[PDB]
Amino acid sequence: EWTGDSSINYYSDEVISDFHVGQFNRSAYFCIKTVKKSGEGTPIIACALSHDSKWIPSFNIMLEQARNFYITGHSIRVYVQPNVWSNKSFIEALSSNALVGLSSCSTSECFGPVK
Amino acid sequence: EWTGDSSINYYSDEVISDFHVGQFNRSAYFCIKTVKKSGEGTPIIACALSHDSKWIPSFNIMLEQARNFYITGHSIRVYVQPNVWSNKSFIEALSSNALVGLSSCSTSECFGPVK
Amino acid sequence: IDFVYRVDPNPPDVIFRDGFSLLGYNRDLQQLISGRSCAGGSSDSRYIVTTSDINKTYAIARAYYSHSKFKGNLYRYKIRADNNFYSLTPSVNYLESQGGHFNAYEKSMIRLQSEYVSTLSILPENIQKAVALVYDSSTGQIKDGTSTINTDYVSISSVSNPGVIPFLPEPQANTQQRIDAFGSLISSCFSIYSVCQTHRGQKTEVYKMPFYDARPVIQFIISGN
Amino acid sequence: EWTGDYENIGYFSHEVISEFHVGQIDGGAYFCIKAVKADGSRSTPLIACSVSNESVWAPSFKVLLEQARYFYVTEQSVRIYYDHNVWTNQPFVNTFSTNALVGLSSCSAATDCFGPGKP
Amino acid sequence: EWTGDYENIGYFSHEVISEFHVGQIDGGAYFCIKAVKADGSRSTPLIACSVSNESVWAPSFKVLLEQARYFYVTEQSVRIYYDHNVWTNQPFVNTFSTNALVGLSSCSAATDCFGPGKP
Amino acid sequence: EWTGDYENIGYFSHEVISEFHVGQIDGGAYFCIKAVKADGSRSTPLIACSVSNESVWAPSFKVLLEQARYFYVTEQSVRIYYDHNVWTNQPFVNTFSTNALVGLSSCSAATDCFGPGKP
């Protein structure tokens, strides 16, 4: 598995607008809500769990990077995997997308794997 | 368990005004005192212990996020579970509420699960 | 708030005769908060930065007396806050509502400064008293010293303006710029040369305080690593 | 044991962490803080240390350090909870103190401080 | 192995980390920085990555990452030490590089860098 | 062993960490700091290194690293405690030093620095 795989969607030129942290079934988790800069609509919510899914190893690096990007408000690309979380209450509360990657988007291009 | 559970209460549009760290029994712990960003109401106190209660897995992420929100003075929603800490002196000193979640509050709405 | 504080090297005579004057005409709030318009950068800010916290004054005195290249005396001047004194937070909220972006670094720095800006020059009539900050080398701690009472103080009983700074320049697109800080995350606008140090041609010659970038410090304390 | 047990834990309110030291003693990382009043009132510094691998206060070390570092880089008013007569290494004690740093709380406003306090 | 083995480790000096990426590959957290010459769009960008669970440079992954983030925050001139032909995953190589980020040093002033250099 | 054992641990006071380097050697993360006099006076700079998996000072590697970073970030005047003749890797020693960084403390002007010192 890799954040550059075809199963991974990504949204570029995002800004992390909302940050949430909590615990879900013995797993520390954090969710980020990112929006297009200048407000193009349909905000994207991506969550990562510390002790669930195959994306466990990158939970801490993803959490620190998401915190840094929320602090700076810098335009970034979010790599998510759809349909990773299955708990219905968690799904409707935040999302089913797993936050699996983050890359700096410096206006001309944007770093990280593409399609 | 989950931060978005029915047993979890939350208070929105709060600002962490006070931060305390210490050791209780054999666990590092950190309590926050939060007031309404619109200056009104009774302050919420919530604590997390590193080696006590069912919220051990989220202690580190919660401490980091509480520190971030306290330093930035962000308007946040605090998710607490009441009646978690049972030591009476600890209860009068700080609270019995366990800090189980933190989310960002915007001018319109806050992120995270709602009741 | 009322009775903000300002640390100045000039003796109470000079300040009670002249007060504090604006460095320049740069009204941009982002350049003020990040310190680009203050002594660290452009040095033409159209604000006089003061603090309502006595502890921030102690921190400024600590930094200047601990850099060990600074020679001379420091005085805390206690200024009554009139309607020309504005808190940073309402204006920052207004600029954010107007499309401006203040990252968490600026938010944290503003929260730490407890800052109040005078859009006009601080007249001597607004200054209550000057407290000398004696730096004894025995224990290396700053002691509040002689308190000189200004005889030109008016006691208007005014309060700081709780509104938004008028005629704020249009907020520029965010570029994640350096935030100038000295001592223990003291904004560079609190430095000696962030206000006009020229006094009828008698410009005080004191140590130029070096400023570090506050963003790495704020990141370091936000995330304990 | 508890940071807030005021019978055996002392505390100084409205302090400022003026000096910070980090080192290693007997195979364990440690940090010591020298704290004073913001104003020159008390005139005697409070020295509180925390050792990562010794005494009953080791578990809080990692968090305390972090909090201490915050309070050191901002000089925010801080109430410091210390346990007296903890360190026994004579050169270490003669250097810093016997005080173990066991707690830190923010002191918003000069009248009240957060955290447990004496009755 | 050593970051300073200039026989097998390359380095570019006076670079500024312009782009940051984090992710997971094959059960291991990884990050990849893009650095350009600290004076504008000079040279070609160096891309260097570090994987937490792969290659001989895994033990430094955390520290480098932290340092990289700080060097990303300050946008200061730095020297980047990389090991070429470390990553073999073909899509990963086509995306970022084969370069493994193995060292970071601060570069203070116009020309002089800290850290090991080529004779 | 102790950072404050002045019989075997040396220290330079009122230094500023001017150069920061991180890397990996022999399967262990390490960082080196080059520090000059805070006054800017003429003096050869001190290079102190810490290796995460080598020597008896490994347990304090993390706490020192973060601390060093902060002292590098703010250009704060510091006292550096080093252990001379610790590293034996000849290219490493020629590149940086034999000195192991074993302690850091804040220096509040004059000659008074926090932490242990010679009587």
Numbering used by the authors:
A (entry chain G), B (entry chain F): 1 to 115
C (entry chain B): 6 to 230
D (entry chain E), E (entry chain C), F (entry chain D): 1 to 119
Paper text:
In this study, we identified and characterized a typhoid toxin-like A2B5 toxin, designated diarizonae toxin (DiaT), as a key virulence factor in Salmonella diarizonae. The DiaT genomic islet encodes two distinct B subunits, PltBd1 and PltBd2, which exhibit unique functional roles. Through genetic and functional analyses, we demonstrate that the heteropentameric assembly of PltBd1 and PltBd2 is essential for cytotoxicity, with our data suggesting PltBd1 facilitates toxin secretion and PltBd2 mediates host cell targeting. The holotoxin consists of a pentameric B subunit arrangement supporting a single PltA subunit, with the amphipathic C-terminal tail of PltA extending into the central pore formed by the B subunits.
To elucidate the structural assembly of PltBd1 and PltBd2 within the DiaT holotoxin, we introduced a C-terminal Strep-tag on CdtB in the S. diarizonae genome. DiaT was purified from cultures grown in TTIM medium using Strep-Tactin affinity purification and gel filtration, followed by cryo-EM analysis. Ultimately, we obtained only a single class of high-resolution cryo-EM map for the holotoxin, at a resolution of 2.32 Å. Despite clear visualization of CdtB in 2D classifications, its flexible linkage to PltA, mainly via a single disulfide bond, caused a weakened signal, leading to its absence in the final 3D reconstruction. To distinguish PltBd1 from PltBd2 in the cryo-EM map, we identified residues with distinct structural features between PltBd1 and PltBd2. Specifically, Ile25 and Tyr82 in PltBd1 corresponded to Phe24 and Val80 in PltBd2, respectively, providing clear markers for differentiation. Detailed analysis of electron density maps revealed a pseudo-symmetric arrangement of the pentameric B subunits, comprising a 3:2 ratio of PltBd1 to PltBd2. Three tightly packed PltBd1 subunits were connected with dimeric PltBd2 subunits to form the heteropentamer in the holotoxin structure. Pore radius measurements confirmed that the PltBd1 homopentamer exhibits the smallest pore radius with significant distortion, while the PltBd2 homopentamer displays a larger and straighter pore. These findings suggest that the specific positioning of Tyr70 in PltBd1 is responsible for the pore contraction in the heteropentamer, which enhances compatibility with the C-terminal tail of PltA. The stronger hydrophobic interactions between PltBd2 and PltA, along with additional polar interactions involving PltBd1 and PltA, establish a finely balanced assembly that facilitates the stable accommodation of PltA’s C-terminal tail by the heteropentameric B subunits.
